Design an enzyme around this catalytic site. Structure first.
Site, PDB file in Angstrom:
ATOM      1  N   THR A 240       0.809  -1.213   0.000  1.00 54.54           N
ATOM      2  CA  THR A 240       0.000   0.000   0.000  1.00 54.54           C
ATOM      3  C   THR A 240       0.845   1.268   0.000  1.00 54.54           C
ATOM      4  OG1 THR A 240      -0.175  -0.066   2.418  1.00 54.54           O
ATOM      5  CG2 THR A 240      -1.894  -1.180   1.148  1.00 54.54           C
ATOM      6  N   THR A 241       1.833   1.354   0.894  1.00 53.94           N
ATOM      7  CA  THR A 241       2.672   2.548   0.955  1.00 53.94           C
ATOM      8  C   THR A 241       3.577   2.652  -0.266  1.00 53.94           C
ATOM      9  OG1 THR A 241       2.649   2.297   3.363  1.00 53.94           O
ATOM     10  CG2 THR A 241       4.208   3.877   2.425  1.00 53.94           C
TER      11      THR A 241
ATOM     12  N   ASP B 216      -1.506 -10.012   7.540  1.00 55.78           N
ATOM     13  CA  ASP B 216      -0.543  -9.702   6.488  1.00 55.78           C
ATOM     14  C   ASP B 216       0.440 -10.849   6.285  1.00 55.78           C
ATOM     15  OD1 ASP B 216      -1.730  -7.315   5.957  1.00 55.78           O
ATOM     16  OD2 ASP B 216      -0.070  -6.051   6.640  1.00 55.78           O
TER      17      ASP B 216
HETATM   18  N1  LIG Z   1      14.975  -6.959   6.964  1.00 55.36           N
HETATM   19  C1  LIG Z   1      14.990  -6.287   5.788  1.00 55.36           C
HETATM   20  N2  LIG Z   1      16.110  -6.221   5.035  1.00 55.36           N
HETATM   21  C2  LIG Z   1      16.138  -5.557   3.864  1.00 55.36           C
HETATM   22  N3  LIG Z   1      15.078  -4.910   3.347  1.00 55.36           N
HETATM   23  C3  LIG Z   1      13.890  -4.894   3.997  1.00 55.36           C
HETATM   24  C4  LIG Z   1      13.779  -5.598   5.284  1.00 55.36           C
HETATM   25  N4  LIG Z   1      12.513  -5.426   5.708  1.00 55.36           N
HETATM   26  C5  LIG Z   1      11.869  -4.677   4.776  1.00 55.36           C
HETATM   27  N5  LIG Z   1      12.689  -4.360   3.757  1.00 55.36           N
HETATM   28  C6  LIG Z   1      12.322  -3.554   2.565  1.00 55.36           C
HETATM   29  O1  LIG Z   1      11.411  -2.514   2.929  1.00 55.36           O
HETATM   30  C7  LIG Z   1      10.424  -2.349   1.908  1.00 55.36           C
HETATM   31  C8  LIG Z   1       9.068  -2.024   2.522  1.00 55.36           C
HETATM   32  O2  LIG Z   1       8.532  -3.189   3.148  1.00 55.36           O
HETATM   33  P1  LIG Z   1       7.161  -3.123   3.994  1.00 55.36           P
HETATM   34  O3  LIG Z   1       6.970  -1.703   4.472  1.00 55.36           O
HETATM   35  O4  LIG Z   1       7.208  -4.236   5.013  1.00 55.36           O
HETATM   36  O5  LIG Z   1       5.994  -3.492   2.942  1.00 55.36           O
HETATM   37  P2  LIG Z   1       5.761  -2.705   1.555  1.00 55.36           P
HETATM   38  O6  LIG Z   1       6.831  -3.247   0.637  1.00 55.36           O
HETATM   39  O7  LIG Z   1       4.355  -3.088   1.160  1.00 55.36           O
HETATM   40  O8  LIG Z   1       5.927  -1.248   1.914  1.00 55.36           O
HETATM   41  C9  LIG Z   1      10.391  -3.641   1.106  1.00 55.36           C
HETATM   42  O9  LIG Z   1      10.458  -3.354  -0.293  1.00 55.36           O
HETATM   43  C10 LIG Z   1      11.616  -4.424   1.537  1.00 55.36           C
HETATM   44  O10 LIG Z   1      12.472  -4.655   0.416  1.00 55.36           O
END
Ligand SMILES: Nc1ncnc2c1ncn2[C@@H]1O[C@H](COP(=O)(O)OP(=O)(O)O)[C@@H](O)[C@H]1O
Ligand SMILES: Nc1ncnc2c1ncn2[C@@H]1O[C@H](COP(=O)(O)OP(=O)(O)O)[C@@H](O)[C@H]1O
Ligand SMILES: Nc1ncnc2c1ncn2[C@@H]1O[C@H](COP(=O)(O)OP(=O)(O)O)[C@@H](O)[C@H]1O
Ligand SMILES: [Mg+2]
Ligand SMILES: [Mg+2]
Ligand SMILES: [Mg+2]
Ligand SMILES: [Mg+2]
Lengths: 523, 527, 39, 529, 309
Positions: B88-89, B389
């Site tokens: 979504t974001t 989720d």
């Molecule tokens: N532990 C992690 N290591 C590397 N990248 C991460 C990690 N957790 C999340 N990300 C990155 O942050 C981005 C945002 O993830 P998230 O906010 O959980 O959902 P969305 O992708 O829907 O915004 C993702 O594209 C992912 O690649």
């Protein structure tokens, strides 16, 4: 206070006609923004709270509140044109506006409106004769020609990148809608092609299912969900014990009468269930509710039951399978059992159960499934598909083709100019004025394309003066003079004839008003 | 203006500027939630309800913004959420970045059609690259565990995230079959306001929200039978209007004693069935009814040692049948002993005013129940949203036969492909391809900004490490150094990213083609 | 539609009378004055 | 519902109360429509067959005139597109004085014929260039259509025959008498070596009988009375004194100082003796009437009546100078006896009354003299004002004819010939200016169409017949007026002649106003105060 | 009529125009203009110290003389051609309307409709009744395509979708009763005393209607028009039997259909005895009853029959 009427405002003279012409010109200039493939889309805000984002000429005009009677008449004629043929809603409005704008030059020269109306009718008759004479036939057995016609008709909407599948979808829908019953009557109704809008997925996942798609679920989880060749039956009456409208009372004085009545109710329910499961069905579709005893009996007999359906959905199911709705379970007979099924799978589309009846013998009613993003995109796709289906139906009803774009208009203008030299009197100036008024569509197309009309207009006028030069149009994408025979752009003749007739009728109706009376409160 | 004086209409430049400003505002507002190192927002409704969530869809729905573009963005986000799962974001971020990149070139003097064609070409190239770069896997227990951990790492801390990951993996493995798609509506989510949040475990069975009503009933049974039915056990009246007519008190007493004989037959049949199944004082019998039970029937059942539950939901009829293995019968026609279920431990729990019912120790259950505990309501809602989720992400990873690495190496590879593909395209589409490539690199920029490092230098280092190598060099969130994304344990999805890109392209095409926001409606000011 | 035209200034406040009624009213007023100034 | 915001850039900082019209539709087209609506108002009152118009301003007055200048002045227009045309008409009236409705009609026709060009695709630059080229061509061909010049300017049997065309267009019916009166008034005041002044004609409105009862007067008149008893004076010797007929005092505040009784007894005696001596010395030079311009005294009036001296008192700071220039005398700021070269020789100074109004007539028996005064007789103030305006228009036309003795055929043949020549010249002009030239040539047909609409005949047939006559060979053939059948008539044989320099200046100002309106792009206004 | 004026003379003129339009239909403004001119002329005579009685007597004498003089300028209609005279009269009457130019086809259509709708009196003078032709209004093409339909046209659609839309040589059966289930009156109540009779009563409540429908369709009917309501059971019976059924029909339309086809509107199935029967001698025989769609709406059209036109 001693007056005749109250709060009455009467206005007569040339001011009413001037105001009507100004309102028509304003409406034409507002609606001229959406024309040609190089046009842009708009966005309307309905008082309910939604968002109307489309490009059709009728969907935008219907969401505009006005107060002038001329604007109301224009909205009415646009709605009638959209409900008649389906396509050509902006061209008729533009032509009517141009014809009413070019009519004010004669009204200021002490000219009577009767001669103007006579010249308008004489020009309409000549235009109809020319359009009927330049009619080109076409075969209906060629699928490639129909696909090309549909693609050229839908090349203006936002499906210019996905018409490779929408054309085939519309062709299949038209082929499945056409049905011949008894006699020599061939009707083509549009109340059987239900269009479903489901948000999500990609636009490439849309297709045409050989059946319908009901958004329901099974009544009990113990029933089956995947049947090979089921026998889908239909019902109408309710499967529960109801009261009576004859005002009946059961006066009892013994003790076992309550138990006897409770046992007789279950006995009648079991008898009705046995009368239902008489020719061994499989799927029962009813319009009312089903009690728990009937559900248990159908589960014991391995029968699937679906409750709470619509009349249109039941009619579509009966048309797809090939059966009829039965009200009394005792008169099921044999021919009323539908055996045209082939697949009954219940899937889940985003936490929602859906019934799929795919693979039929000879179905006559299909359901188009659309998968997009939100709701506005789905509504736009549905409107484009409906317009394409209406265009295909109008083409199939009259196998006639005329060169679109601006070649037919220039040909009609040249034919009217070459014939206006034999006329004399006061019926010659309006004839030559309305003969050149048909160039408002190619001029607007050129202005919306490359915005270079002062050269392309005279280039097209000097080209149509020759003999075999009646199919030369203007390409809206580039902006050069190209032949319509090699480009592939075609349009039906009935739509253009209806547009011309509506424009002439609107001009005649608006050119005979010189009084405005308001303030009588109707009654 | 001439026909409707009370109508507000905007031109093309004004509408474009308004849309660009709205997109920039929605992008700057929803930019601190990307990644696990983001911030937590607090939302307070009009009634005084505190909500502590981190999802983008809920934050956008509860932000109090009245705008058509914002409404369309919220609808697209809700569609993406209830169709796929997580995304979504990032959707709004990419949409805003693409709109900004388009307005950067439109203001200089360009046409929206060429920009739309370039965006479509770049989307097709990115789709081809994603289809040619995806790797196939078997999806074992470790892969799903890592996927759930990566999906839940951006919600809570470390212990709760791992606990939720393990619970989701166990529930999925328990509801897993040999074929057919994974059917949902089976894992019951029950919330309890007691103890803490660290005591979250999975119960192999079903947890009801109501218990027994008769005080003289058994509370703990070591071995009982499960009876699933929905027959009515209350005083039901006939459909036709009737009436009783007696003479003296004896006839009235006889009519009173005879009018309660319909339910007595069913009670006697149930008693006989229980005596035939059990017999001695060694086994139990639990009756699961969907409708209400009269006090007389309740007392008659409690006199023999039967624990009956009345007023149940319709969804519990399938979960109990899938867990125990009974038969959900409606009538008492063929009352066979084979239509019963097998239990292991039927005990209740009192939490002040409400009552619960726990059914544990099952043979081969197929519908488990996740137990959620929280001291507050906002924490319970956040844990439930995180569990949903994670379940959606696990289902999307299982339904697909490929895995996509997370971090931001995929975006860098797509940008490199678009940069290497623009000279092969004719016309003025090179500017559109460049804008689409620059708009796709907004994920690493936000991922590096929220951590506490630089943006331009980090992007330059990532590009330099990716151009000289041939691996998916991701972006680290601990030290800022370029590391591998498909080696540590960061994963994502393929269909989710494809749907996100499709929605972004559709939104860009719809916005770049609309340049007139006319409002000609009824004010409704009569009276 | 016969629209009323403004002739005399402040026509919606003044009043115009014929002649016979005015003469009768004047005669009645004179008779009343003579009867009052008679004792 | 959903409300849309404002444009974050210029619409937010636009400030309430003001307006903005940057687009060509909400600016150029709006100005064109406003100019067309303004031209459609004063279109029926153009030719001699046009009706009058009764306009009432905010001062609760009455103005029933026929010229377009007075109508535009008494309208109070709140539109710049029409304000430009009003200013152009005012400038044309100040310059020439007989070309306002023509300029307005020409500007309206040019704007109406350029609106369609701008709609079909012709830009503002090409249209402006074509209009300028057509205006230059018309100004170059205009001196080639004269074939008429004025012989003598002091002949009474020739001046009245030239201004009759201009008088008939303003006062249809009674024009010969007005033309003869204007010719006589211009002859009686015509000096030598040219140099004709417009302030040498005085108009007097006296409510009397009809229009035929009016006449001319070789002198001046004043609506005052006689302070003394002297009325009929034969050989009058006017002695105008700019100082008030009273005892002169000091400018600085100063009182008289008396001590003994001799001064108190002799002060008034000496004052009266000095006053009598001054009165006797003033009348010793032969003055028969004294015209003062201030406050009079009782003792001075008594001493003047004792020696039979007529006293005329008037204060206007202009009538005194006019009388001094008429009688040929100079003003004296002191009460000193004038010299022989500072005397005002007259002919007959009496006091009569006409139409229940006492007036002092200064009729002179000389045929030449200086200035004159036209006495008007009527029963309505509106008719007298219309007659005065017609007399002023005739005087302006006579002044224009004196400045330039070149005549052009009036009616509508000159415009048709100019349009035909422009169409013939624009046929060999390549490029995109040919359309603008043909449109400018079509604007000249608005005058015959308006004339035919005001007369009550078909305009198309009249235009076709005029074009056929011009193509046959005749050039001085216009449109007939005294005929209900739409026919043609010669303009040179009848006597329909108008000025040439006036029409040239009118066409120039119309073209200037047209190009100025076309040069306006966007409109930026504020809030009214 | 749609002016609403609070003046007595205005209301008098309005009611006079309404009476003129109701008695004739043409010349509603000329009479008002003549009356206004007569009033204006009589006002000048009244202002000239003339008694209104003499003016009224003179007006009456002049009107009588004019009426007596009109008979001197009469032209026999049978002495001319007839059809051409009627066409000219129709073109003159339609000259001040919206179809003044296209008056060559509308006049012929009106003449044909008048010649078709011709009723005979009691063996005397021929009559020409009006307000009987169904003038339908539907948006579509131009006005020149509006042809004449030889027969009747109903503004209703079919009942069930399973019924055919094209029956050749059908039988029109006009009914004046609703086709619903049996329902007792207010004074007749049901007091169930035995449980072995409620089911029989509930079955007979539908069996009576089933037998009535079977007796109605026993003569081989195809077109059945019902002015009331039609239940689902009757619709299913008509679908299984293969016949059309139209519900919610007007009374005037049913009367016109029965008069054109020769049928008789039967409000009940009773006869001269105590048995509800149905004869085949009172069935209207039609020809082709095809339902045509006219711009997003359908309507049943009835062609010519065998009784009248
Ligand atoms: N532990 C992690 N290591 C590397 N990248 C991460 C990690 N957790 C999340 N990300 C990155 O942050 C981005 C945002 O993830 P998230 O906010 O959980 O959902 P969305 O992708 O829907 O915004 C993702 O594209 C992912 O690649
Ligand atoms: N690709 C094309 N080539 C030539 N002519 C076109 C093309 N697309 C549209 N047109 C012309 O533009 C006109 C307007 O079509 P459109 O805007 O799609 O619907 P409407 O006719 O309702 O305005 C049509 O008459 C058609 O002839
Ligand atoms: N006797 C006449 N016959 C025909 N036209 C005339 C006659 N007198 C004047 N005109 C026309 O009247 C016009 C001038 O009228 P007027 O409004 O009085 O002055 P202006 O030139 O300021 O408009 C001239 O263009 C001329 O053609
Ligand atoms: Mg179209
Ligand atoms: Mg996330
Ligand atoms: Mg003049
Ligand atoms: Mg008539």
């Amino acid at each position: 206070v001693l007056v005749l009427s109250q709060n009455t405002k009467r206005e007569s003279g040339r001011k009413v006609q001037s105001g009507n012409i100004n309102a028509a010109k304003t409406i034409a200039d507002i609606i001229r923004t959406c024309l040609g493939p190089k046009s842009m889309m708009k966005m309307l805000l309905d008082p309910m709270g939604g968002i109307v984002m489309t490009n059709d000429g009728n969907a935008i005009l219907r969401e505009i509140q006005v107060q002038h009677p001329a604007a109301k008449s224009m909205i009415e004629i646009s709605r009638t044109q959209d409900e008649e043929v389906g396509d050509g809603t902006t061209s008729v409005i533009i032509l009517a506006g141009e014809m009413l704008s070019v009519a004010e030059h004669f009204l200021e020269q002490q000219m009577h409106p009767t001669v103007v109306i006579s010249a308008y009718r004489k020009a309409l008759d000549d235009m109809i004769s020319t359009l009927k004479k330049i009619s080109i036939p076409v075969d209906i057995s060629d699928s490639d020609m129909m696909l090309n016609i549909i693609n050229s008709s839908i090349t203006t909407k936002a499906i210019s990148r996905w018409s490779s599948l929408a054309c085939n979808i519309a062709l299949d829908a038209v082929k499945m809608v056409q049905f011949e019953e008894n006699g020599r009557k061939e009707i083509d109704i549009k109340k059987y092609a239900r269009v479903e809008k489901i948000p999500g997925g990609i636009i490439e996942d849309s297709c045409v299912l050989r059946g319908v798609m009901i958004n329901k679920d099974v009544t009990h989880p113990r029933m089956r969900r995947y049947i090979k060749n089921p026998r889908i039956v239909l019902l109408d009456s309710s499967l529960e014990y109801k009261k009576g409208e004859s005002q009946t009372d059961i006066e009892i004085t013994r003790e076992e009468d309550f138990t006897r009545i409770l046992q007789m109710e279950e006995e009648y329910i079991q008898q009705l269930c046995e009368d239902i499961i008489q020719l061994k069905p499989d799927v029962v579709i009813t319009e009312k509710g089903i009690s728990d005893l009937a559900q248990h009996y159908l589960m014991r007999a391995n029968i699937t039951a679906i409750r709470r359906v619509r009349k249109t959905d039941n009619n579509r199911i009966a048309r797809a399978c090939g059966a009829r709705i039965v009200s009394r379970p005792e008169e099921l007979r044999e021919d009323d059992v539908g055996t045209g099924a082939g697949l009954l799978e219940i899937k889940k589309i985003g936490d929602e159960y859906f019934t799929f009846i795919t693979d039929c013998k000879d179905p006559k009613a299909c359901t188009i499934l659309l998968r997009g993003a939100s709701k506005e995109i789905l509504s736009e796709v549905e409107r484009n598909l409906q317009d394409a289906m209406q265009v295909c139906r109008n083409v199939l009803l009259d196998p006639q083709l005329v060169p679109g774009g601006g070649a037919s208009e220039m040909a009609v203008a040249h034919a009217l100019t070459e014939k206006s030299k034999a006329m004399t009197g006061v019926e010659q100036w309006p004839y030559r004025a309305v003969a050149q008024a048909l160039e408002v569509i190619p001029r607007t197309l050129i202005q919306n394309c490359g915005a270079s009309t002062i050269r392309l207009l005279t280039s097209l006028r000097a080209k149509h003066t020759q003999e075999n030069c009646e199919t030369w149009g203007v390409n809206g994408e580039t902006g050069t003079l190209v032949d319509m025979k090699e480009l592939g752009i075609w349009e039906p003749l009935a739509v253009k004839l209806q547009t011309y007739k509506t424009a002439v009728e609107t001009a005649v109706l608006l050119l005979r008003i010189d009084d405005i009376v308001s303030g009588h409160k109707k009654k | 203006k001439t026909l409707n004086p009370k109508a507000e209409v905007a031109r093309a430049q004004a509408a474009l500027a308004v849309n660009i400003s709205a997109a920039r505002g929605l992008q700057d507002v929803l930019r601190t939630n990307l990644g696990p190192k983001g911030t937590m927002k607090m939302l307070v409704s009009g009634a005084g309800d505190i909500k502590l969530t981190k999802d983008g869809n809920v934050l956008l729905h509860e932000m109090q913004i009245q705008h058509p573009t914002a409404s369309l963005i919220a609808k697209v986000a809700t569609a993406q959420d209830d169709i796929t799962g997580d995304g979504t974001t990032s959707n709004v971020l990419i949409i805003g970045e693409l709109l900004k990149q388009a307005d950067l070139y439109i203001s200089e003097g360009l046409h929206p059609r060429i920009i739309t064609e370039g965006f479509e070409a770049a989307k097709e190239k990115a789709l081809q690259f994603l289809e040619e770069v995806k790797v196939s896997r078997e999806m074992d227990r470790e892969t799903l565990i890592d996927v759930a951990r990566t999906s839940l790492r951006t919600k809570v801390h470390a212990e709760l995230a791992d606990v939720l990951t393990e619970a989701v993996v166990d529930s999925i493995l328990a509801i897993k079959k040999q074929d057919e798609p994974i059917d949902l509506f089976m894992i019951e989510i029950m919330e309890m306001k007691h103890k803490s949040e660290t005591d979250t475990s999975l119960i192999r069975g079903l947890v009801l929200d109501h218990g027994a009503r008769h005080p003289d009933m058994k509370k703990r049974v070591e071995d009982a039978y499960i009876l699933t039915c929905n027959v009515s056990l209350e005083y039901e009246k006939t459909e036709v209007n009737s009436g009783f007519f007696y003479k003296s008190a004896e006839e009235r007493e006889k009519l009173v004693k005879a009018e309660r004989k319909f339910i007595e037959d069913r009670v006697k049949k149930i008693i006989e069935l229980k005596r035939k199944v059990c017999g001695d004082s060694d086994k139990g019998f639990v009756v699961i009814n969907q409708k209400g039970i009269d006090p007389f029937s309740l007392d008659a059942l409690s006199k023999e040692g039967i624990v009956a539950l009345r007023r149940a939901k319709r969804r519990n009829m399938e979960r109990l049948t899938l867990a125990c293995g009974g038969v959900a019968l409606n009538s008492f026609d063929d009352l066979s002993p084979d239509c019963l279920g097998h239990a292991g431990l039927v005990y209740e729990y009192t939490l002040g005013e409400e009552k619960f019912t726990f059914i544990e120790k099952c043979n081969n259950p197929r519908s488990v129940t996740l137990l959620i505990k929280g001291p507050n309501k906002h924490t319970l809602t956040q844990i439930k949203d995180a569990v949903r989720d994670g379940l959606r992400a696990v289902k999307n990873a299982i339904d697909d036969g490929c895995v996509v690495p997370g971090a931001g190496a995929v975006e860098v590879a797509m940008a490199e492909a678009l940069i290497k593909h623009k000279p092969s395209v004719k016309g003025r589409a090179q500017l559109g391809v460049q804008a689409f490539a620059d708009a796709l690199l907004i994920i690493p920029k936000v991922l590096a900004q929220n951590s506490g490092f630089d943006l331009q230098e980090t992007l330059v280092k990532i590009q330099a490490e990716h151009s000289e190598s041939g691996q998916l060099v991701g972006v680290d969130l601990n030290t800022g150094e370029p590391m591998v994304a498909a080696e540590v344990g960061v994963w994502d999805n393929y269909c989710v990213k494809k749907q996100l890109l499709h929605s972004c392209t559709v939104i860009a095409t719809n916005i770049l083609l609309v340049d007139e926001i006319m409002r000609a409606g009824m004010s409704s000011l009569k009276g | 539609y016969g629209r009323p035209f403004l002739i005399i200034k402040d026509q919606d406040r003044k009043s115009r009378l014929m002649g016979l009624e005015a003469l009768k009213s004047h005669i009645m007023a004179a008779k009343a004055v003579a009867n009052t100034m008679r004792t | 519902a959903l409300h849309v915001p404002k444009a974050p850039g210029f619409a937010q900082m636009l400030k309430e109360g003001a307006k903005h019209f940057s687009g060509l539709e909400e600016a150029v087209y709006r100005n064109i429509q406003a100019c067309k609506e303004l031209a459609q108002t004063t279109r029926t009152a153009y030719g001699p067959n046009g009706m009058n118009k009764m306009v009432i301003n905010h001062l609760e007055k009455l103005f029933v005139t026929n010229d377009a200048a007075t109508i535009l002045r008494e309208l109070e227009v709140q539109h710049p597109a029409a304000k430009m045309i009003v200013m152009a008409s005012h400038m044309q009236e100040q310059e020439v004085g007989d070309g306002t409705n023509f300029v307005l009609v020409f500007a309206g026709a040019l704007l109406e014929l350029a609106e369609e060009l701008l709609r079909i695709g012709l830009s503002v630059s090409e249209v402006i260039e074509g209009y300028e080229i057509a205006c230059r061509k018309a100004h170059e061909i205009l001196p080639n259509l004269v074939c008429c010049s004025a012989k003598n300017l002091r002949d009474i049997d020739e001046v009245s025959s030239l201004l009759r065309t201009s008088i008939m267009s303003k006062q249809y019916g009674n024009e010969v008498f007005l033309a003869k009166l204007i010719a006589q008034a211009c002859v009686s005041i015509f000096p030598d070596s040219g140099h004709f002044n417009v302030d040498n004609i005085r108009v007097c409105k006296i409510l009397g009988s009809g229009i035929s009862s009016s006449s001319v007067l070789h002198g001046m008149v004043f609506k005052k009375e006689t302070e003394g008893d002297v009325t009929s004076v034969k050989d009058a010797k006017i002695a105008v004194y700019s100082c008030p007929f009273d005892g002169m005092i000091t400018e600085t505040k100063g009182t008289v100082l008396i001590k003994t009784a001799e001064e108190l007894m002799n002060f008034s005696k000496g004052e009266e003796n000095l006053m009598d001596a001054q009165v006797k010395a003033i009348a010793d030079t032969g003055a028969n009437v004294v015209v003062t311009g201030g406050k009079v005294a009782d003792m001075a009036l008594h001493y003047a009546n004792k020696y039979n001296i007529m006293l005329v008192r008037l204060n206007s700071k202009w009538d005194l100078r006019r009388l001094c220039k008429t009688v040929g005398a100079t003003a004296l700021p002191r009460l000193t006896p004038p010299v022989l070269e500072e005397m005002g020789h007259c002919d007959s100074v009496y006091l009569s009354e006409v139409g229940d109004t006492q007036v002092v007539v200064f009729k002179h028996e000389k045929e030449d003299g200086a200035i004159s005064t036209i006495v008007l007789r009527g029963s309505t103030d509106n008719l007298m004002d219309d007659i005065e305006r017609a007399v002023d228009d005739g005087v302006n036309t006579f002044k224009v004819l004196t400045r330039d003795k070149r005549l052009v055929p009036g009616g509508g043949a000159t415009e048709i010939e100019l349009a035909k020549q422009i169409t013939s010249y624009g046929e060999t002009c390549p490029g995109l200016e040919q359309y603008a030239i043909k449109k400018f040539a079509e604007a000249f047909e608005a005058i015959p169409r308006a004339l035919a609409e005001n007369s009550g005949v078909k305009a198309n047939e009249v235009i076709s017949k005029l074009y056929a006559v011009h193509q046959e060979g005749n050039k001085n053939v216009g449109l007939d007026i005294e005929a209900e059948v739409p026919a043609v008539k010669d303009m040179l044989e009848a006597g329909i002649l108008d000025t040439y320099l006036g029409k040239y200046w009118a066409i120039k100002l119309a073209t200037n106003a047209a190009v100025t309106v076309l040069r306006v792009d966007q409109i930026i206004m504020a809030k009214p105060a | 009529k749609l002016l609403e004026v609070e003046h007595p003379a205005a209301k008098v003129l309005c009611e006079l125009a309404d009476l003129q339009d109701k008695e004739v239909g043409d010349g509603t403004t000329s009479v008002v203009i003549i009356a206004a001119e007569l009033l204006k002329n009589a006002d000048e005579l009244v202002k000239q110290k003339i008694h209104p009685t003499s003016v009224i007597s003179g007006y009456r004498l002049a009107c009588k003389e004019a009426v007596r003089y009109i008979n001197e300028n009469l032209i026999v209609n049978t002495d001319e051609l007839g059809r051409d005279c009627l066409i000219n009269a129709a073109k003159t009457s339609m000259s001040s309307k919206i179809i003044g130019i296209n008056g060559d086809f509308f006049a012929n259509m009106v003449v044909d409709a008048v010649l078709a709708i011709k009723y005979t009196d009691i063996r005397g003078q021929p009559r020409y009744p009006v307000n009987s032709v169904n003038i339908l209004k539907a948006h579509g093409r131009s006005q020149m395509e509006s042809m004449l339909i030889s027969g009747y046209a109903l503004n209703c659609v079919v009942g069930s979708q399973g019924m055919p839309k094209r029956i050749v040589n059908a039988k029109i059966a006009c009914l004046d009763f609703s086709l619903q289930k049996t329902k007792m009156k207010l004074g007749v109540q049901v007091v169930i005393t035995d449980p072995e009779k409620l089911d029989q009563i509930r079955q007979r409540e539908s069996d009576i209607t089933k037998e009535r429908i079977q007796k109605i369709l026993a003569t081989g009917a195809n077109v059945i028009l019902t002015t009331g309501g039609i239940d689902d059971m009757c619709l299913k019976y008509f679908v299984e039997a293969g016949a059309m059924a139209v519900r919610r029909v007007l009374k005037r339309d049913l009367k016109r259909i029965a008069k054109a086809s020769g049928a008789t509107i039967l409000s009940t199935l009773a006869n001269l005895e105590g048995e509800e029967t149905f004869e085949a001698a009172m069935l209207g025989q039609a020809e082709e009853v095809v339902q045509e769609r006219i711009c997003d709406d359908e309507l049943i059209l009835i062609k010519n029959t065998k009784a009248r036109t």
